[PDB]
């Protein structure tokens, strides 16, 4: 008895690690994509160490004042989301959620004393994202769907362009985005049900690994944001090695690129070119066409035999050339080891991926969360993980500031102000940039009345937050 929970954030900036959520929209559906129960819509009050990015507030229309006025404390905000997410059998899905919104969720759970991952895998739960399914559909079975292009003819998967081009539309608040996501998913399910079921059924770690055929040197299709839109985000790849550090990474080679440099260079030169940003490569030297597949992120892979002859022709795929390159790679006994060889703080808010929680810590965290604000002030717990002490403090200071001692309040105030004002103290943006970016935006000739009010609100928020 499983369900799909579709969601989206509007946030105060584009850095999931540092910029906090402002709005959440959620809609649960059955596996037919028909809604169950009511949509959820929540605002999150910004804690008093938050400085939003001006441009984001203009795009969303959401000021810190609006969020404070209509929202919940972050603890309750995330607890209500966590409730919906952790209902057994729930697959939590969205549109580009895995590489953005889910990171916002992980960091938010983390700060608020939840395990960042349990909602993703316990009690039959899982994740999904439709963006790579759409990339595969457009690349491999585009029939029956209008694939929009922008003004200069470049391909676009933007939610609004896609929905209008296919006549399933009906502004950018989170709720409209979520409903448009569900509708786009329905459209794929209707026009290409077999692909839809293939991608969905194969979305998990185990199943994605199996599709890679590691290590039979079998070429497969892989779609990714990292491959060029001019090639429909698709490449013919082969899995060559497990990633040295990331246990969920498999490194794959784009068989359209001459592998001579990968074969000929030593481990030192290979590491060098592989860590040189493409912009900084010398002239005549292209990049090493290796790419990491993150098995835990619902990567989309299909067998080479999914190509019909019109698809190969349409995608301008040279199978012989790929085969020729594959032959050369099969001959190198040492290549996997060489690849693995070539590929090899402080702030608790920035240390989510520094290590996993123990079973013990998880238990004390749960107990602390069950307490009332008063009980929580008296707790005096003991942690195995070194990150949790300071982390517990900020959680109390942000959501329950009336619960602090006089000297605790002075500690919060020192941290709070220097996060708001000094570079590298947690925030993506500090007060002076915030004001400078407000100035830049104020100088433009094409501000709406609404834009001005928002920029006015932002000035007032900065004035108020430092007093
Ligand atoms: Mg979104």
Numbering used by the authors: 4 to 173, 176 to 349, 357 to 479
From the paper:
It is involved in several important DNA repair systems in E. coli, such as RecBCD-dependent homologous recombination, methyl-dependent mismatch repair, and genomic tandem repeat maintenance. According to the two-metal ion mechanism, two magnesium ions are essential for exonuclease activity, with MgB binding directly to the enzyme and MgA binding via the 3' end of the bound ssDNA substrate. The results of activity assays and sequence alignment indicate MszExo I is an E. coli Exo I homolog in Methylocaldum szegediense.
The overall structure adopted a doughnut-like shape with a large groove through the center of the molecule, closely resembling E. coli Exo I. The N-terminal exonuclease domain (residues 1–197) is located in the middle of the molecule. It is flanked by the SH3-like domain (residues 198–355) and C-terminal helical region (residues 356–479). Site-directed mutagenesis study showed that D104A and D182A mutants were devoid of exonuclease activity (data not shown), supporting the two-metal ion mechanism in 3' to 5' exonucleases. E. coli Exo I exhibited a cooperative two-state transition at 49.0°C (Tm) while MszExo I followed a non-two-state transition with calculated Tm values at 53.1°C and 57.4°C.
